[PDB]
Design a protein around this nucleic acid. Structure first.
Ligand SMILES: [K+]
Ligand SMILES: [Mg+2]
Ligand SMILES: [Mg+2]
Lengths: 354, 144, 74, 95, 21, 49, 49, 55, 92
RNA sequence: CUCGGAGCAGAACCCAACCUCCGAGCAGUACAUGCUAAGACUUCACCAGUCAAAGCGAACUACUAUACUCAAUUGAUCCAAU
């Protein structure tokens, strides 16, 4: 019995007639490159991607961010070509590149990167960390506005918050320094949330900081809707991820319903879901910036539960499933003597009635 | 008598993809012994160098790309005489290491071929990544 | 007493092992060197033939080995 | 087997079973592997590892070995510091 | 499997020159 | 077992308890012909004892 | 499943075969997988200090 | 069935008394290996003492 | 209670409230559990012996370079790389 | 007269004839071919045989290394030697 293929087979296009007059591969890297192309294509037969691939929806994730900038490609391309000619004309750059002693300045690469393609990288990174999925239920946005956050540790040092770098609760005990480029007359809204910190509800999040109606770049002038509260990742709970969200307001907004007392050491008021927050303010508010870090437990977290929150520190533990053992049989034929220890609860001798 | 803030659930739900990778208890995709390359990793450094450019990628075993560094982007191209030379490869590692620390990526495997590993351009890209603080071997998974 | 004498004999022979291993490692490289040198000698004997292959290819090597032995005796 | 001896009129015990097997009070019989001291230079460590393991016997074997031995070898003993003391009783066994 | 539509997907020797001394 | 024998009066704790008093109270059953050398006091039931 | 077969470069017999294939051909082979059912573990509350 | 090789007994030099049997070619000098000695829990030199049989 | 307890040397109490700080509750008590036996006797004996081991480690003053744990080797790399991301104020 | 491969036996397993063909009774490289241990296959019984995660201990930053290549490459109990 035979069934006809449900579609074109892999190597059908090849002509077998002039098999001696066909370009071969001749190399392993040239076959490997074609083999990766056909591995990332849809097929009618069963594939590893079907059973393990991360399922996605056909509905393209909507964009809720700011519009892109408008740039003249022709005038841009012209300036870039000219600069390369000048750089290549210098014989000292040719000699350094031939002797393998040249190097690029890492500080200038990052300043231009943050302007051109940093937002798209930060977006790709946030999708990997699962921020859009949890915060906005799949909706995406490009962070057009670079958000520079940094925690003051001591009097001379700074711990920069980028996109997933580790930061301790000891360094994050006091509010950070937030700077971002904005025009005069604009209104913004900052926000800090713990996606994984919640102790009771999985889906919910804790609100750590909320500043509303910020004029321009001056963060202090902004109203303090929710005071700063340091992260308190429980012990044995893993690594958490806190996100700084920057919204661009179109007009002055009233956050009376989202207001929280000063201080707010109750975890039921701190509870907060970003999706609902933005959904009722999406008409007048738009996401513009993003930054996040990862946090573990340290000794300072015990000071937060005891003193600030006036509660007992919860301690978790990673527990694994109990090992599998087949059903014990009366005559375990050919099994070693230690077969009986696998079904034994206690290790101390028993004596029964005696 | 009871307290509201002491209401904690018995089981803790952490939704962070890297929580178990960073605790070294997340399972690696073992297998694939008769083919190349392997899959028993969490993050992988993949280098793509064309006739004109050089590209380095850090991607997860699931396929997603975490961070990247290419000579196609103006930021790096405006400072290089040649995008296809050894210097470019050495400079792509200095830029990628700086971006992997910011993302939080400190370990990753590198699966080169015998001729790629012996090349002076790949020897300088690894040295540049290590000098940046990235380790080219992942820690062993914890099973017990 | 028997458990003490044996524990000392074991601790008395392990004090020489670090040096014994080194001396043994040297002998291996010494003997290993001869293997590489022996191959070179054989290759030279073939070049002396100068592509004059045939039945008289085995005995030619024997003639020259005898010469090497004479040099060692002297 | 001798079912009725000519002097006592009682069943005898086969002493070839007593020199090879051990009976746990539960009814299990433990033995060695045939060939755990033969030609170890041509066998692998994995094969040698499972050759020096003490294994159990099946129902048919254990029923035979119980017929080839008398009741004296099925009694509960309380030897001092016996290595098999914990194996003389089953735990969490159903059916 | 012979009855399945994806039978013969692993065939490779018809793409190679017949080299049989 | 020992505490059970004492709560029922089968072994009196007011006098020294030896191997004979245990047998007379049917607390143990010694088989000297079966290479028995006595009784071993085990720790089972130590908490309630 | 049916997946694309890429041999290891050290393996000479298989690498001497793909270098003789026409450009555009790809080799396929049948692979068997195990899709895990249970997670590595769970975080459980064990104490309130 | 020409006996090309033989089975020999390699004895440790640490005096532990641990020994193992290995196969070596007949026309060859006595072996001096560096095998693991479980008694002292580290690699130690061994030496051929006596031949067991002819393979 | 660790501090109130006066049958331990003063410097030891401070040395014990740092090492075994994860076994101390909010009130200040040092808790020691053990469930490795059926008999309450043996379980208590294990807990008591843990205290005798705490008072010895704190008094021995051991400062020898013990072996590093394998689970703690990636945290040493993580911390090291978290210090080179640290920056100084432009104008201090 | 024992063992292994192929056909008969086309596609899970199994399948005979004093049926049709080809072979085996080794060799070579290592000297961690060290210890231990979940879970499994099994020549239609038993005996025997086989594959193995984790772990200890090593090795390691190159070696498709962490159960060597190799198809079969073989012999129970008692007993003897030690
Ligand atoms: K949670
Ligand atoms: Mg069977
Ligand atoms: Mg293993």
């Amino acid at each position: 019995r035979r069934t006809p293929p449900l579609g074109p087979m892999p190597n059908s296009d090849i002509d077998l007639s002039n098999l001696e007059r066909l370009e071969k591969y001749r190399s392993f890297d040239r076959y490997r490159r074609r083999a990766e192309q056909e591995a990332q294509a849809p097929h009618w037969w069963r594939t590893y991607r079907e059973y393990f691939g991360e399922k996605t929806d056909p509905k393209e994730k909507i964009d809720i961010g700011l519009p892109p900038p408008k740039v003249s490609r022709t005038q841009q391309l012209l300036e870039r070509k000219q600069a390369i000619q000048e750089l290549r004309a210098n014989v000292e750059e040719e000699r350094a590149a031939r002797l393998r002693t040249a190097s690029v300045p890492l500080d200038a690469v990052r300043a231009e990167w943050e302007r051109t393609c940093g937002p798209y990288h930060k977006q790709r990174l946030a999708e990997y960390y699962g921020l859009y999925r949890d915060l906005f239920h799949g909706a995406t946005f490009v962070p057009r506005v670079p958000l520079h956050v940094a925690y003051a540790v001591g009097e001379d040092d700074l711990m920069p918050v980028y996109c997933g770098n580790e930061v301790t609760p000891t360094e994050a005990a006091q509010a950070p320094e937030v700077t971002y480029e904005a025009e005069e007359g604009s209104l913004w809204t900052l926000l800090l949330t713990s996606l994984d910190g919640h102790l009771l509800e999985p889906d919910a999040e804790y609100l750590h900081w909320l500043l509303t109606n910020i004029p321009g770049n001056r963060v202090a002038e902004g109203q303090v809707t929710c005071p700063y509260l340091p992260p308190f990742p429980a012990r044995g709970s893993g690594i958490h991820r806190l996100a700084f969200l920057l919204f661009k307001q179109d007009q002055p907004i009233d956050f009376s319903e989202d207001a929280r007392p000063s201080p707010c050491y109750q975890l039921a008021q701190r509870t907060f879901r970003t999706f609902d927050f933005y959904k009722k303010h999406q008409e007048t508010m738009t996401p513009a910036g993003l930054s996040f870090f990862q946090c573990r437990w340290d000794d300072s977290v015990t000071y937060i539960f005891h003193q600030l929150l006036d509660m007992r520190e919860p301690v978790f533990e990673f527990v694994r499933p109990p090992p599998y053992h087949p059903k014990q049989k009366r005559f375990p034929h050919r099994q070693p003597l230690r077969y009986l220890d696998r079904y034994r609860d206690s290790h101390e001798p028993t004596y029964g009635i005696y | 008598d009871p307290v509201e803030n002491e209401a904690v659930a018995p089981e803790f739900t952490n939704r962070n993809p890297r929580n178990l990778e960073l605790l070294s208890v997340a399972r690696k995709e073992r297998g694939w012994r008769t083919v190349f390359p392997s899959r028993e990793f969490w993050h992988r450094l993949r280098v793509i160098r064309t006739q004109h450019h050089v590209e380095a990628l850090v991607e997860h075993q699931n396929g997603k790309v975490v961070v990247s560094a290419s000579t196609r982007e103006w930021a790096i191209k405006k400072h290089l005489y040649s995008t296809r030379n050894v210097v470019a490869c050495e400079s792509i590692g200095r830029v990628l290491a700086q971006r992997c620390l910011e993302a939080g990526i400190n370990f990753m495997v590198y699966q080169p071929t015998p001729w790629e590993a012996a090349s002076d351009s790949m020897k300088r890209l690894q040295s540049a990544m290590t000098e940046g603080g990235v380790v080219l071997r992942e820690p062993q998974r914890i099973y017990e | 007493q028997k458990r003490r004498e044996r524990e000392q004999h074991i601790a008395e022979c392990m004090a020489k092992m670090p040096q014994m291993i080194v001396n043994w490692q040297q002998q291996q490289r010494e003997n290993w060197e001869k293997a590489q040198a022996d191959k070179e000698r054989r290759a030279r004997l073939q070049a002396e033939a100068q592509e004059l292959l045939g039945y008289q290819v085995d005995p030619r090597s024997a003639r020259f080995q005898e010469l090497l032995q004479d040099l060692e005796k002297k | 087997l001798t079912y009725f001896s000519a002097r006592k009129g009682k069943r005898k015990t086969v002493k070839a079973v007593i020199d090879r097997f051990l009976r746990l009070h539960c009814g299990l019989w433990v033995r060695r592997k045939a060939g755990y001291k033969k030609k170890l230079w041509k066998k692998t460590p994995a094969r040698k590892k499972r050759l020096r393991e003490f294994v159990f016997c099946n129902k048919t074997q254990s029923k035979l070995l119980d017929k080839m031995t008398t009741s004296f070898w099925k009694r509960r003993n309380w030897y001092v510091d016996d290595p098999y003391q914990k194996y003389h009783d089953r735990t969490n066994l159903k059916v | 499997y012979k009855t399945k539509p994806t039978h013969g997907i692993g065939k490779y020797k018809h793409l190679i020159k017949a080299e049989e001394p | 077992r020992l505490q059970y024998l004492i709560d029922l009066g089968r072994v009196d704790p007011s006098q020294p308890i030896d191997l004979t008093q245990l047998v007379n109270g049917r607390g143990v059953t010694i088989q000297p012909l079966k290479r028995d050398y006595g009784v071993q006091l085990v720790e089972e039931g130590a908490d309630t004892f | 499943t049916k997946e694309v077969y890429v041999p290891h470069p050290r393996n000479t017999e298989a690498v001497d075969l793909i270098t003789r294939l026409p450009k555009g051909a790809v080799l396929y082979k049948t692979f068997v997988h195990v899709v895990p059912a249970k997670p590595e573990g769970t975080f459980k509350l064990v104490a309130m200090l | 069935s020409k006996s090309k090789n033989i089975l020999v007994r390699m004895v440790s030099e640490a005096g532990t008394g641990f020994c193992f049997n290995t196969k070596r070619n007949r026309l060859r000098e006595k072996l001096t290996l560096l095998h693991y000695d479980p008694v002292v829990k580290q690699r130690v030199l061994f030496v051929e003492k006596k031949k067991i049989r002819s393979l | 209670h660790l501090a109130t307890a006066e049958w331990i040397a003063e410097p030891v109490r401070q040395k014990i409230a740092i090492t075994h700080k994860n076994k101390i509750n909010r009130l200040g008590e040092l808790i020691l559990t053990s469930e490795s036996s059926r008999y309450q006797f043996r379980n208590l004996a294990d807990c008591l012996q843990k205290i005798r081991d705490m008072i010895t480690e704190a008094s021995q003053t051991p400062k020898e370079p013990t072996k590093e744990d394998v689970k703690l080797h990636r945290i040493r790399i993580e911390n090291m790389n978290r210090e080179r991301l640290r920056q100084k104020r432009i104008h201090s």
